Design a protein around this ligand. Sequence first.
Ligand SMILES: [Mg+2]
Ligand SMILES: [Mg+2]
Ligand SMILES: [Mg+2]
Ligand SMILES: [Mg+2]
Ligand SMILES: [Mg+2]
Ligand SMILES: [Mg+2]
Ligand SMILES: [Mg+2]
Ligand SMILES: [Mg+2]
Ligand SMILES: [Mg+2]
Ligand SMILES: [Mg+2]
Ligand SMILES: [Mg+2]
Ligand SMILES: [Mg+2]
Ligand SMILES: [Mg+2]
Ligand SMILES: [Mg+2]
Ligand SMILES: [Mg+2]
Ligand SMILES: [Mg+2]
Ligand SMILES: [Mg+2]
Ligand SMILES: [Mg+2]
Ligand SMILES: [Mg+2]
Ligand SMILES: [Mg+2]
Ligand SMILES: [Mg+2]
Ligand SMILES: [Mg+2]
Ligand SMILES: [Mg+2]
Ligand SMILES: [Mg+2]
Ligand SMILES: [Mg+2]
Ligand SMILES: [Mg+2]
Ligand SMILES: [Mg+2]
Ligand SMILES: [Mg+2]
Ligand SMILES: [Mg+2]
Ligand SMILES: [Mg+2]
Ligand SMILES: [Mg+2]
Ligand SMILES: [Mg+2]
Ligand SMILES: [Mg+2]
Ligand SMILES: [Mg+2]
Ligand SMILES: [Mg+2]
Ligand SMILES: [Mg+2]
Ligand SMILES: [Mg+2]
Ligand SMILES: [Mg+2]
Lengths: 205, 80, 56, 154, 122, 129, 81
Amino acid sequence: ARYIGPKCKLSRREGTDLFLKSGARALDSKCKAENVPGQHGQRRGRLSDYGLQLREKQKVRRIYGVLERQFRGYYQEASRRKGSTGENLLQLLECRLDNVVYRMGFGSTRSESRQLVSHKAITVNGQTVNIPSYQVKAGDVVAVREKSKNQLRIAQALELCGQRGRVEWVEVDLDKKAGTFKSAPARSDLSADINENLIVELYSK
Amino acid sequence: TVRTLTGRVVSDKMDKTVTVLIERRVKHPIYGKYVKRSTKLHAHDESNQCRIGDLVTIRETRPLAKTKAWTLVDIVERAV
Amino acid sequence: LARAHAGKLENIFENMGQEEKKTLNIVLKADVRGSLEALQGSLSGLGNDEVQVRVV
Amino acid sequence: GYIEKLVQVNRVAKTVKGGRIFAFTALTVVGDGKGRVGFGRGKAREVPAAIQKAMEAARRNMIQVDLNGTTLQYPTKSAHGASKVYMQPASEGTGIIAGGAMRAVLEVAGVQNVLAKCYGSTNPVNVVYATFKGLKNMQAPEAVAAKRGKSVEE
Amino acid sequence: ATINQLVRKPRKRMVDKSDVPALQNCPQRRGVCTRVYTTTPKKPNSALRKVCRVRLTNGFEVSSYIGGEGHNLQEHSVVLIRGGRVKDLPGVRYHTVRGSLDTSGVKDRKQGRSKYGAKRPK
Amino acid sequence: SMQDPLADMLTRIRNAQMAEKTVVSMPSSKLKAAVAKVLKDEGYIADFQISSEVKPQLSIELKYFEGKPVIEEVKRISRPGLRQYKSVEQLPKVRGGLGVSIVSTNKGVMTDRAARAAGVGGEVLCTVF
Amino acid sequence: MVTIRLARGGSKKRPFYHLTVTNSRNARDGRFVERIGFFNPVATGGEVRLSVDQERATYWLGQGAQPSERVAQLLKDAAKA
RNA sequence: AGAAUAAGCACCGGCUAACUUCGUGCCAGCAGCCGCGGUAAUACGAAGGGUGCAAGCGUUAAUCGGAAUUACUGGGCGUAAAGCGCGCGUAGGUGGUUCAGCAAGUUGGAUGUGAAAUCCCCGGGCUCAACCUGGGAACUGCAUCCAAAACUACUGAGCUA
RNA sequence: AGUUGGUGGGGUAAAGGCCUACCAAGGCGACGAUCCGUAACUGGUCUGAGAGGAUGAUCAGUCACACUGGAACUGAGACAC
Ligand SMILES: [Mg+2]
Ligand SMILES: [Mg+2]
Ligand SMILES: [Mg+2]
Ligand SMILES: [Mg+2]
Ligand SMILES: [Mg+2]
Ligand SMILES: [Mg+2]
Ligand SMILES: [Mg+2]
Ligand SMILES: [Mg+2]
Ligand SMILES: [Mg+2]
Ligand SMILES: [Mg+2]
Ligand SMILES: [Mg+2]
Ligand SMILES: [Mg+2]
Ligand SMILES: [Mg+2]
Ligand SMILES: [Mg+2]
Ligand SMILES: [Mg+2]
Ligand SMILES: [Mg+2]
Ligand SMILES: [Mg+2]
Ligand SMILES: [Mg+2]
Ligand SMILES: [Mg+2]
Ligand SMILES: [Mg+2]
Ligand SMILES: [Mg+2]
Ligand SMILES: [Mg+2]
Ligand SMILES: [Mg+2]
Ligand SMILES: [Mg+2]
Ligand SMILES: [Mg+2]
Ligand SMILES: [Mg+2]
Ligand SMILES: [Mg+2]
Ligand SMILES: [Mg+2]
Ligand SMILES: [Mg+2]
Ligand SMILES: [Mg+2]
Ligand SMILES: [Mg+2]
Ligand SMILES: [Mg+2]
Ligand SMILES: [Mg+2]
Ligand SMILES: [Mg+2]
Ligand SMILES: [Mg+2]
Ligand SMILES: [Mg+2]
Ligand SMILES: [Mg+2]
Ligand SMILES: [Mg+2]
């Protein structure tokens, strides 16, 4: 399945930016993002430790747009792997094909990059892939099919990704829309607000 | 070569055969203590030269009767 | 289910109006559906004002 | 040190002619996250006053704990009353695998890899006593070397 | 105990008895309804609970609770019973499944209407 | 009825360091002497002396360092009712190796580190930290 | 007799074969005496199409083991290379 | 070719993430445990809103866990359950202290075996995954040889606590 | 009470109370015989930090059965799906 619906109540409930719109205009001047959704919005309601852990996990899942069973699989694989599962989970989440296409500026958001990947418009090693879970390895060359290189979507996505910050782990060849995955981005390459310790704490119970 | 078993003689009332007791010491599977177990074997004494209390050694051969497949080769500690 | 409930309602109303009836309960098996329906239809006009026959 | 964790808040009562008087008790732990930790209890007729008293009591009588870089030296087993406590060092990727009062105590003290467990009564205050009793009698090397030289003992 | 005493007599494990002796390891069992009536709850509660006596295919005869706000169960109706005791009524260890064989499910229910056998209003 | 005298040695040392004494006296044996020797080699005691005349007595001098006894915890592992035997890889590490565990090997009575170095298992006797 | 044949594994429409030395009156995927290599009808990429133990195959052929038709053809092909 | 053909289920008093109005009034009903309902019910029934999952969601049945609640690892017996009313003694368990020997226990090594699959590690093929598959590790065990002699066992001779 | 052992003989593809005739009075058992109830066994599977606990669907090895109770024939091989 997939979460299809209002993609801004999630930001208000989580209480952070949690990028889900294109970021073109703003976030504050679309939803008054200071109240939880629903009738009881003005209430604050300090919550418990289990609530904090649940909110952290939900925030990560809604950032990357994956459901619970696939996320449990990701956690099990991160625990199986060596070296501190806490950032192993982020390493593994940051290597999905839709996320990589988003980071390369081909799509405005994760939903639009999923739209592109699922609709057979992306080739990884010169051959078509349409699974928005394909773990891209270091050194792959994500490109755009020639019959799909004239879509405007890519044009606006690129010109708007031009100003959001330098990822500095993928090299995009802007003129013909070809990328490159140098390596997985380390923990210091991501925002230092996610407390993955809460996620590991939640699942270890 | 040939492997043997060593033990005491506990009965010789039968004819041309003897009853030998073999003591083994086995560690208990769960509680770890060492307990002693006993095995009773019927061995073949061709010339009836073993008496109760003797410490002897035996080996394995083909069955010679039912419930009798061991033959003795040497008396090493004669009883009083 | 709906027919059973409606029949129960009507029968309960009529019985509470009158009083009680003595039932003769039978379990009927047959070889063909036509024979079964004929038997069920024909074993309904055999009762009385105080006794009745039911196919359970 | 300034890290406040509200371990527990409870309502107690006493009986006099007329009825009941209610009081509020609070148990908290304070520390800097780099070696020092203390605990405090505070009672009042108001929850904020009890919590402030507990914080002020815990800010006193702090103790210094020897730890091996956000990790314990060796497994420890400590008891207080009917409460028993087991602790043992864990690797870097682990979090705090502990329950309730132990988690607050260990997080405040500054250890991050503890893989702990408790047996017996799970009264939070007695668990806190048992956890400080275990953590305070923690020797670490260069102190166990009172006998002889160093690097030969290990 | 000592190691010698434990070797001579190992520690013994006590088995826990099932709460539902009828329906022996089955999720549900069907039966025929022998009596339909109402009973009075225990002391702190007051109500008129709906219970039915059911004879199962095992040969057992038990008492089953009928949930919901209205039912249509008579004598000689075939029902499906499942586990779960009613704490308030003494001696009732089973529940009747609404909407399974002859129970028809609760009418006009619109919230949580899968524990009561009610279809989607659409 | 003195079923086990080595546990009596350990208990005498323990009870004497609880009572803040300096010297401990007991009947001696060739195993108690080895245990005392390895304890001294590890620095847990000051000295040990053995008398003459057919009833020799072992006298152990205790250390204190600060206002607490040097021997914090001592306990006998293999009592005459269990007889625990261990291999090389199963030798216990008391307090992460900060303490020592005495092992009787076919090469004599020594410490766990010495047994690991020599690649020899044996009979675990007692543990000290 | 004792034969050398192909035991089928893998999955639906994706067959893999083990070259097995079996008593002839056993199940195709039942008990065997020894496995002396494998055969891959699809292979591709880094997968090898077939591999055999020369030593074991010659030893078993010297002891009077009758290979099947496919085993004969594949074994002679492997000996060719 | 066209957005066209495709979202439901449980829950919202605490445990345990998520709350208010309207009906009813110890009724009707709910309930895993505490417990709710007697005229302002966040617990019954609806409606708005929200929280979990999602082609599934709940309930029932069953096993282990949490339960250190049969405690070998790892519990207890003055008053919470728990020292036989008290001796003597059989099997059994256990054994003060020195030499010397043996080698059953004990320790180390070598050899053989411990089917394949399964679990685990590194790889390879299906667009990915499930799945299939190569090599390795493991199978904690058993048997036979060689070696050692601190401890226990056994044998011989002593000593007096 | 062929029960336990010895001897002569028979029988089997083959050792053997497997059978038979004499001789002796042995054999097993609180380290649980006999009896009662229950149950194909294993690799393995599910849980568990481990130790353990529960359990033998699919896959593979072994065993037993072929409406019920017996018996043999043919055959290298059956007491014969
Ligand atoms: Mg799915
Ligand atoms: Mg004979
Ligand atoms: Mg308790
Ligand atoms: Mg239940
Ligand atoms: Mg809440
Ligand atoms: Mg109201
Ligand atoms: Mg409630
Ligand atoms: Mg409600
Ligand atoms: Mg259950
Ligand atoms: Mg347990
Ligand atoms: Mg339970
Ligand atoms: Mg114990
Ligand atoms: Mg207890
Ligand atoms: Mg009492
Ligand atoms: Mg009393
Ligand atoms: Mg008494
Ligand atoms: Mg005695
Ligand atoms: Mg002695
Ligand atoms: Mg003795
Ligand atoms: Mg294997
Ligand atoms: Mg691949
Ligand atoms: Mg190997
Ligand atoms: Mg020697
Ligand atoms: Mg006869
Ligand atoms: Mg003869
Ligand atoms: Mg024959
Ligand atoms: Mg026989
Ligand atoms: Mg004869
Ligand atoms: Mg018995
Ligand atoms: Mg059976
Ligand atoms: Mg456990
Ligand atoms: Mg079994
Ligand atoms: Mg089957
Ligand atoms: Mg099979
Ligand atoms: Mg027959
Ligand atoms: Mg013939
Ligand atoms: Mg047959
Ligand atoms: Mg046939």
